[PDB]
Design a protein around this ligand. Structure first.
Ligand code: MG
Ligand code: ZN
Ligand code: ZN
Ligand code: ZN
Ligand code: ZN
Lengths: 51, 66, 113, 51, 1157, 45
RNA sequence: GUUUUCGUUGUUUUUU
């Protein structure tokens, strides 16, 4: 294997090979106190859904 | 064949773990704890290593032209 | 063999501008702003920032097509402030917010590790 | 020159995916922002491989 | 000994495949071919006599040639320059050769002038690539490592001219069985008792006979019976042929027919037959009667007429029973009973004979097919010796005898049958079967394996019917019930089951001895009064004995087949109700290994398995504790082979649960038979696994039993065309198409038969992340939304390879074209493509970035007469790009350089690309979105792909949900999950474990809108699934044509996306346009977009009979001398063609530009 | 210039339009056009 | 040198 390589400045937007991150976790309202998700449930909403 | 350089679902540096993964395998070790040892936290990264199929060993055991 | 290109998502062509404002006489003190080379990231931010402005009477944006990194934003303000001026105000406000964000982050990063 | 049993597109794309230590990538000029013909170091870091 | 669990059954199947495998039937078939079949076909007439009766005083100068032993040689390809080498299959593929070996015979001579050894080359036989005489048979893997063969590539095919052709086995009805059918009412025939009476050995057709019943009820006079014997020109009454066949009195005819003498209706119904045959009262008149209608020549007179009638009653009448003398009494008894069965079926006292039950059908493998073709070709081999030893016998020369043997006799029939596909001779192109041999597919690895285990029913659409296409209960566990082709061939072209094996053909004589061991009562003894309730015994369909105590003999035969003295595959069936018994050893009857539940109620093992954990442990050893192989289990009487005809007479347990006859409220379990009235059940057998009713493809699907059967069939169909990795040495193969995945991934959901399939080692598909919602609105209507990050990282990236084959040709003997760089001077009629890529020998270098409109293989061809050379190059395909993978330079068989250039391309998914799941879930890409725009999880995790929820209400794939759930669980826990059908897994437990995984039991999880980060109100079911790339892309169908090449004859746009084809405008499109009022639009579609020529026709005759010249401006109607009354017509060229053939058929279609009125 | 390589004997060589297809030393008629030493450039993405 | 030159029979498998 004999290879030469050219690296140029880039961003994740143009390729995941320049991606600075794999995934970024973003959260808020850790109890759904703002009512942004339904807590879909078969029996009950608070207990079916974890903390 | 050949584990991806970057994790398809996530994008984590994963390539430099295969030999380490085999090392962990050799000692009759469970799979999941070994993957956790490999810093495989996201189950996407986890099954990417768990379910990767490398195939070059049969290809390489062919005697090449040179 | 027909799909579009990737660097154009932010590279400005000569003929079209980054910012094309046209008067929206539909309601008084309203304009329509075409941001080429843009997407939800800046659009939603500016939309919320303008919505927080009391002068801003109408604020909305739309990415007319997801297959093109561009969007258009309709902005009406009260009879006092112009839509464009509200836009510079929103941009500068988010500037100062980002400054404070970066400063606090850096300080507590340093004290943390 | 390559005498392996793998496609060169394979290894090339994989090499692109490889992150490079880039604490100063900001100073690097873009391949389109930099005015030079072909590549210069300022907009292009050269890598090499021989095995 | 203990209970039998599922893993023990898996171990049993491991023994099964370690001895048999899945090619064992083909291997043993082709080995039987060149170990018993070939020799018998050679010696089926071992006597060749000539003579010169005259003088030499008087003499019989007897040239007499006796046949002898055949010879088999190891493959040697004999280069065209005397540099003979032993041939290797790799070289055969590289140089486009045939995997064929030379054969030789000993046709010795014996000269007998009366007063009154030699080794010739018969021919070259193509060989199946894993027979015992294959070049690489004894050679070990390291030797294989030197000859570059894929270890998973498992042979079973034939190599001819570098093309791999497989002989598809053909299913046909088993012969020598009574077939009574209900003839149509508006016909003199009511019931047709048919039997294809043909020699059991060889399984080849000799003759057949159909006895037709005349008359109606209160209509059509008496119930007379007159059948047309083979090669007779009239329906002769059956009582008459009984007179002719030896039994002239009618009471003998009834003793042959009547066997329930308590019945009066059949007596009074056969009375009219006696009345009509009463004109015949002896054997002489009956035989003359037959001979008159016997289609023989005229002038044969009564004596030879009777002799020929007797012969045709002897030969070609029940030939499977006998063709020689002495058994014409057996002929009388058999015909009498067959007529009796006809009459009983006519009375409807028995259900009419079924036409699909496999017990009356066999499968002709490659073995007997090649046997039949060799029979044909050799029957045209033995005769050209006669037709040359006559032109030389008159000269009585010192004949070389090595020039009358045209050895290529058996080369060309096989070459044409295996190459073109027609099993016969090219001269007899008509009435030939097409498709029995086809090119082996290596698109994927299964595209070979499953391809090697097809079956086909070559009936034809002559009468459409659903019975050849409809699944039947007898197909249970014997065939795959989901693998079927599309519309034209759907239902037909059927696959085996997983554990099936085909009878390779054992001598029937051992079975004859086993049966006669029990005091058989001859057919002559069979009497209506004596044998009022005795058991009629049949072999292979031939009725060969009677018995009154059949229980002992059937028990002994069953236990003996359990032992092994009887060939373990030989079918034993006991028709208790109809006082009959039948043994089948003919080739083509397919058997499944059933666990032997003790059926004789004499122990607790009755209702349990003879095979126990002792046998399981012995198999787990792989050997015997003093070998225990699969044949060990089969011959130990704990597992036995069973056919469908046996299956319908046996009662089988499904799972190890219902073996012992048994004596709550769970919504995650299946159902066994209720056992409410039938308090007892003595299941004589149990399947090794119900999941073995599946097929090779069906052993792939995760829980195929939780999804709709139509979707299961769609899965089966799409599985063979799904992208993957076919062979390890794909590179050394120069194939039309090769597809290799960048990153093969073993499925998270797995079967256990998977383990046997080695799907970890050749996996087809990847485990990618999917979430269910309607986020983009583009997911509708079979479209999916893709993560661009995974694509950039290379998810489902792949490699495609295309091999172009080129060769120099011989116009004469020395007139040859050459591979050279075309130029503007030496080469005429050049092409706009760039020739520069060619360097010295018209061959591009390996590794160059090739594209379309660029010549890759340059060729120059002589012009028939200084500047007499034409471009004959074959450039790369126009809309194809890539880099040359490989360039192979060799020669042909004799002397011309043959080049194989494989080009390599990287394929990446794009909007519109086709994909499918393992649950029939098929669609194209609708739009691709980047990471930032799609919503993320609480941990910020996005899926790789997004699907349409609307599939679930419509397509209803519960198994897909189970697969995704198990996939999440396995990925979190880090192990391979099992999805074997008919197992005890429960979804609720998996949900509980997901709770243990710290994740929502039903798989829901909050997504946060990618554009806003806002918590999407619903919690999204989001996790991994195993999907597969499919052969169909978007850019291979994109094709626009404003103007291109036109067909040479039609002067209209060509058809085919390859050659810039135009859109064929269907007639319904014309009709809808007419209903749309599209006059001008359709006109220009037929005028400017289609053929349009202008002509000059006459105004007097009104024909195109006008010499026309625009430049001369002369238009003379030679028909009518018309020059001024000539009119120009701009009409489609197809109209000109129509007018042309109308003229050519002496029809005068006088076009008129006016109105007669 | 136009170089050629043998099947598995690893013989490297060069035929012209004067000789038949025959690996000069091994006597192997399955020969292969030796790859071009010329560089090929890729996009690594 | 504007311009500028490929086809069919038969066979198999296919595609909502
Ligand atoms: Mg369609
Ligand atoms: Zn991951
Ligand atoms: Zn530069
Ligand atoms: Zn005329
Ligand atoms: Zn050599």
């Amino acid at each position: 294997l004999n290879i030469r390589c050219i690296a140029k400045k880039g961003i994740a937007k143009e390729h995941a090979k320049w991606s600075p991150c794999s995934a970024i976790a973003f959260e808020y309202d850790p109890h759904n106190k703002l009512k942004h998700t339904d807590f879909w449930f078969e029996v009950d909403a608070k207990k079916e859904w974890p903390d | 064949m050949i584990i991806p350089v970057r994790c398809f679902s996530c994008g984590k540096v994963v390539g430099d773990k295969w030999d380490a993964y085999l090392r962990l395998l050799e000692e009759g070790k469970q799979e999941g704890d070994a993957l956790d040892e490999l810093k495989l936290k996201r189950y996407c990264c986890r099954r990417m290593v768990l379910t990767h199929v490398d195939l070059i060993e049969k290809f390489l055991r062919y005697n090449p032209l040179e | 063999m027909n799909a579009p290109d990737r660097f154009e998502l932010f590279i400005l062509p000569d003929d079209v501008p980054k910012l094309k404002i046209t008067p929206d006489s539909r309601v008084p003190n309203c304009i329509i702003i075409k941001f080429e080379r843009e997407d939800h990231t800046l659009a939603n931010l500016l939309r919320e920032e303008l919505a927080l402005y009391p002068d801003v009477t109408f604020v909305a944006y739309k990415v007319e097509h997801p297959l093109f990194a561009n969007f258009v934003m309709r902005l009406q303000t009260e009879e006092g402030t112009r839509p464009k001026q509200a836009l510079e105000r929103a941009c500068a406000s988010i500037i100062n917010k980002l400054k404070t964000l970066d400063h606090k982050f850096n300080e507590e990063w340093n004290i943390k590790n | 020159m390559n005498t392996s049993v793998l496609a060169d597109e394979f290894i090339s794309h994989r090499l692109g995916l490889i992150p490079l230590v880039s604490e100063d990538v900001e100073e690097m000029k873009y391949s389109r922002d930099c005015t030079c013909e072909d590549y210069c170091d300022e907009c292009s870091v050269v890598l090499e491989l021989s095995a | 000994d203990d209970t039998i669990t599922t893993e023990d059954c898996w171990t049993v199947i491991s023994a099964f495949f370690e001895e048999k495998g899945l090619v064992s039937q083909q291997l043993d078939s082709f080995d039987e071919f060149m170990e018993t079949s070939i020799q018998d076909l050679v010696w089926e007439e071992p006597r060749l006599i000539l003579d010169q009766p005259a003088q030499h005083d008087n003499i019989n100068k007897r040239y007499e040639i006796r046949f002898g032993k055949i010879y088999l040689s190891r493959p040697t390809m004999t280069e065209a320059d005397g540099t003979t080498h032993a041939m290797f299959p790799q070289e055969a593929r590289l140089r486009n050769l045939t995997y064929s070996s030379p054969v030789y015979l000993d046709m010795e001579k014996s000269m007998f002038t009366s007063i009154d050894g030699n080794k010739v080359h018969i021919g070259k036989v193509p060989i199946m690539l894993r027979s015992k005489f294959c070049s690489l048979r004894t050679l070990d893997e390291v030797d294989l490592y030197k000859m570059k063969e894929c270890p998973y590539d498992m042979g079973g095919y034939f190599v001819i001219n570098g093309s791999e052709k497989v002989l598809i086995a053909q299913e046909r009805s088993a012969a020598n069985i009574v077939q009574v059918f209900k003839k149509a009412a508006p016909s003199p025939i009511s019931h047709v008792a048919e039997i294809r009476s043909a020699l059991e050995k060889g399984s080849r057709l000799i003759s057949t006979m159909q006895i037709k019943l005349y008359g109606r009820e209160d209509k059509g006079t008496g119930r007379t019976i007159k059948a047309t014997l083979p090669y007779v020109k009239q329906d002769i009454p059956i009582v008459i042929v009984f007179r002719a066949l030896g039994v002239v009195p009618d009471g003998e005819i009834l003793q042959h027919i009547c066997y329930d003498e308590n019945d009066w209706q059949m007596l009074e119904m056969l009375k009219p037959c006696i009345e009509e045959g009463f004109v015949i009262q002896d054997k002489e008149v009956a035989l003359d009667f037959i001979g008159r209608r016997g289609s023989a020549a005229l002038g044969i007179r009564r004596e030879k007429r009777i002799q020929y009638a007797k012969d045709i009653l002897q030969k070609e009448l029940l030939p499977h029973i006998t063709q020689e003398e002495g058994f014409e009494t057996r002929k009388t008894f058999f015909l009498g009973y067959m007529v009796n069965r006809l009459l009983l079926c006519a009375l409807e006292r028995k259900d009419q004979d079924d036409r699909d039950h496999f017990g009356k059908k066999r499968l002709d493998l490659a073995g007997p097919l090649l046997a039949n073709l060799f029979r044909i070709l050799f029957r045209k081999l033995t005769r050209e010796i006669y037709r040359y030893m006559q032109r030389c016998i008159e000269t009585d020369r010192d004949f070389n005898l090595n020039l009358a043997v045209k050895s290529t006799t058996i080369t060309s029939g096989l070459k044409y049958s295996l190459a073109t596909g027609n099993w016969g001779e090219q001269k007899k192109a008509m009435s030939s079967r097409a498709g029995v041999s086809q090119v082996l597919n290596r698109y994927t690895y299964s595209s070979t394996l499953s391809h090697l285990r097809r079956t086909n029913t070559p009936i034809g659409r002559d009468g459409k019917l659903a019975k050849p296409r409809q699944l039947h209960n007898t197909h249970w566990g014997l065939v795959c019930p989901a693998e079927t082709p599309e519309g034209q061939a759907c239902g037909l072209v059927k696959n085996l089951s997983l554990l099936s094996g085909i009878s390779i053909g054992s001598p029937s004589e051992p079975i004859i001895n086993f049966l006669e061991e029990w005091g058989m009562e001859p057919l002559e003894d069979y009497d209506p009064a004596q044998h009022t309730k005795s058991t009629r015994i049949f072999v292979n369909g031939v009725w060969t004995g009677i018995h009154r105590d059949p229980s002992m003999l059937v028990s002994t035969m069953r236990d003996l087949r359990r032992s092994g003295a009887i060939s373990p595959e030989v079918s034993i069936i006991r028709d208790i109700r109809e006082r009959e018994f039948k043994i089948f050893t003919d080739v083509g009857r397919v058997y499944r290994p059933l666990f032997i539940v003790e059926d004789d109620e004499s122990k607790d093992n009755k209702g349990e398995l003879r095979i126990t954990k002792e046998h399981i442990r012995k198999i787990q050893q792989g050997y015997d504790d003093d070998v225990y192989g699969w044949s060990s289990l089969v011959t130990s009487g704990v597992i036995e082979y069973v056919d469908g005809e046996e299956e319908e007479t046996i009662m089988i347990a499904m799972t190890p649960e219902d073996l012992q006859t048994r004596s709550l409220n769970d919504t995650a379990k299946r159902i066994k038979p209720e056992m409410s009235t039938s308090s007892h059940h003595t299941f004589t057998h149990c399947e090794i696994h119900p999941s073995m009713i599946l097929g090779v493809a069906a052993s792939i699907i995760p829980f195929p039993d939780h999804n709709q059967s139509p979707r299961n069939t769609y899965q089966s169909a799409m599985g063979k065309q799904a992208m993957g990795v076919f062979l390890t040495n794909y590179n050394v193969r120069m194939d039309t198409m090769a597809n290799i995945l960048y990153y093969p991934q073993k499925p998270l959901a797995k079967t256990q038969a998977m383990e046997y399939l080695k799907f970890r080692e050749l996996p087809a598909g990847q485990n990618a992340i999917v979430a269910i919602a309607c986020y983009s609105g583009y997911n509708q209507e079979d479209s999916m939304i893709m993560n661009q990050s995974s694509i950039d990282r290379g998810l489902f990236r792949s490699l495609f390879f295309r091999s172009y084959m080129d060769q120099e040709k011989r116009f004469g003997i020395s007139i040859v074209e050459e591979f050279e760089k075309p130029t503007r001077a030496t080469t005429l009629r050049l092409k706009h493509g760039t020739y520069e890529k060619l360097d010295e020998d018209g061959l591009i270098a390996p590794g160059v970035r090739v594209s379309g409109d660029d010549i890759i293989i340059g060729k120059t061809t002589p012009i028939p007469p200084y500047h007499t050379k034409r471009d004959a190059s074959t450039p790369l395909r126009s809309t194809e790009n890539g880099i040359v993978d490989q360039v192979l330079l060799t020669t042909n068989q004799e002397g011309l350089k043959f080049v194989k250039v494989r080009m390599r391309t990287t394929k990446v998914p794009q909007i519109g690309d086709k994909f499918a799941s393992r649950h029939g879930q098929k669609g194209t890409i609708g739009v691709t979105y980047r990471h930032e725009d799609m919503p993320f999880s609480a941990e910020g995790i996005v899926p790789d792909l997004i699907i349409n929820p609307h599939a679930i209400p419509s397509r209803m794939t519960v198994a897909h949900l189970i697969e995704c759930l198990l996939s999440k669980v396995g990925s979190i826990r880090g192990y391979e999950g099992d999805a074997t059908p008919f197992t005890d897994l429960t979804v609720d437990a998996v949900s509980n474990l997901l709770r243990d995984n710290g994740y929502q039991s039903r798989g829901f999880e909050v997504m946060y809108n990618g554009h806003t980060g806002k918590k999407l109100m619903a919690q999204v079911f989001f996790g991994p699934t195993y999907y597969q790339r499919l052969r169909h892309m978007v850019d291979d169908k994109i094709h626009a044509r404003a103007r291109g090449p036109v067909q040479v004859l039609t002067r209209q746009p060509v058809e085919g996306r390859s050659r810039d084809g135009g859109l064929r405008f269907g007639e319904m499109e014309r009709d809808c346009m007419i209903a749309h009022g599209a006059a001008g639009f359709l006109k220009e579609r037929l005028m400017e977009a289609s053929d349009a020529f202008r002509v000059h026709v006459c105004g007097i005759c009104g024909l195109m009979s006008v010499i026309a010249n625009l430049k001369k401006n002369q238009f003379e109607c030679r028909s009518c001398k018309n020059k001024t009354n000539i009119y120009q017509l701009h009409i489609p060229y197809a109209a000109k063609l129509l007018f042309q053939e109308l003229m050519a058929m002496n029809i005068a279609p006088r076009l008129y530009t006016e109105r007669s009125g | 210039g136009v170089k050629y390589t043998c099947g598995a004997c690893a013989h490297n060589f060069s035929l012209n339009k004067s000789d038949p297809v025959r690996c000069k030393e091994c006597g192997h008629r399955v020969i292969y056009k030796a790859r071009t030493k010329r560089m090929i450039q890729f996009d690594a993405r």
